[PDB]
Amino acid sequence: TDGAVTTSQIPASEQETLVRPKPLLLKLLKSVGAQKDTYTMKEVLFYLGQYIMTKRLYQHIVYCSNDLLGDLFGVPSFSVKEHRKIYTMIYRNLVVVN
């Protein structure tokens, strides 16, 4: 299911940034129906939201220490409300399109 999710915590133009997920993150997105190689950050957040629900990882905390998401983010858990922190962890797993 294609879509996008935006937040008031991140600048609008930043959520429009075109990105190329690295192979593990790309594989994760394709496991929940993504089909392309290039995305906006807001589409990436939509697919990751679907992945968190499918894997049942969601006090508003996601527990991801025994999941591929935990390996990519480098944390055992995180608040779903701290959007800059989530953006920081996602940026480490992709290449911003030049």
Ligand SMILES: CC(C)(C)C[C@@H]1N[C@@H](C(=O)N[C@H]2CC[C@H](O)CC2)[C@H](c2cccc(Cl)c2F)[C@]12C(=O)Nc1cc(Cl)ccc12
């Ligand atoms: C509920 C989930 C299935 C857990 C998905 C979440 N939903 C967004 C979100 O902010 N919910 C909270 C709103 C306030 C409520 O009191 C508690 C939940 C969040 C969100 C939306 C836009 C941008 C950012 Cl950065 C963001 F975090 C959310 C999402 O869409 N995709 C995504 C990906 C990762 Cl990796 C973590 C958390 C989410």
